Amino acid sequence: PQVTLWQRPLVTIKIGGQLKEALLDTGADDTVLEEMSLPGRWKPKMIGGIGGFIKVRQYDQILIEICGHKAIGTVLVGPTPVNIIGRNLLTQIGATLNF
Amino acid sequence: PQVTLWQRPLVTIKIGGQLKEALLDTGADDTVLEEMSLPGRWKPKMIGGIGGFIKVRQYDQILIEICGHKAIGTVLVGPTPVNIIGRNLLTQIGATLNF
Numbered sequence: 001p002q003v004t005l006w007q008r009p010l011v012t013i014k015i016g017g018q019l020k021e022a023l024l025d026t027g028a029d030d031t032v033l034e035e036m037s038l039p040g041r042w043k044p045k046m047i048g049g050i051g052g053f054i055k056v057r058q059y060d061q062i063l064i065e066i067c068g069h070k071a072i073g074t075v076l077v078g079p080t081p082v083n084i085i086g087r088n089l090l091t092q093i094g095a096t097l098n099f
Numbered sequence: 100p101q102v103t104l105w106q107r108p109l110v111t112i113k114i115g116g117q118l119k120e121a122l123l124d125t126g127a128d129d130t131v132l133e134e135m136s137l138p139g140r141w142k143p144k145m146i147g148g149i150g151g152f153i154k155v156r157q158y159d160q161i162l163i164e165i166c167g168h169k170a171i172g173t174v175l176v177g178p179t180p181v182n183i184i185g186r187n188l189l190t191q192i193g194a195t196l197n198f
């Protein structure tokens with residue numbers, strides 16, 4: 001799916017039987033995601049980006065549906081104010097930054 | 100220029116006769132950039148993302164060359180550990196997130 005709209009390319013993601021807006025974060029290397037409803041079987045970690053380091057849960061193997069398209073990947077669940085989709089997911093949906 | 104390489108789409112940008120690695124961050128809305136020497140003419144501000152809020156300088160009208168291509172835009176110079184290229188710049192180089 002092409003997504004330009006000279007604005008934030010957000011995609012309705014479907015993780016842990018849930019749906020939220022995801023900020024296509026081609027900048028991040030993984031798909032972070034504000035706290036949500038995910039089952040255990042994950043690993044505790046912390047990302048360090050702009051402002052400070054937040055705590056998230058590396059959920060490897062999460063069927064996140066972006067753009068009505070199935071896409072499993074590592075979703076980090078933490079206190080992030082946005083559902084970040086990094087390369088870990090831009091590689092499953094085949095996202096490409098052509099400019 | 101198409102950039103997938105299932106990894107971080109970094110691009111050597113040339114801002115104010117300067118050059119650094121820019122993490123193509125379609126997630127951000129503007130082009131943040133670790134502290135550096137910009138062409139003056141800017142305003143003090145602070146972005147609030149992952150971890151906390153960092154302080155940057157909205158440098159509006161900065162000739163940032165991405166992919167050997169000239170591209171003026173708003174480069175926020177602050178204590179960011181990376182040169183983020185948000186939509187503000189993904190709209191000048193005509194970037195498109197297709198997956």
Ligand SMILES: O=C1N(Cc2ccc(CO)cc2)[C@H](Cc2ccccc2)[C@H](O)[C@@H](O)[C@@H](Cc2ccccc2)N1Cc1ccc(CO)cc1
Nearest residue numbers: 027028029030047049050124126127128129146148149181
């Ligand atoms: O912290 C941000 N991370 C941090 C981050 C770390 C780890 C992951 C998962 O691996 C994802 C995101 C990225 C930028 C960055 C990456 C690495 C080092 C330094 C910076 C991201 O790529 C960017 O999209 C937004 C995400 C965001 C945006 C809004 C609200 C919450 C989170 N930010 C913050 C940001 C804020 C404003 C601008 C300018 O508009 C740019 C970035």
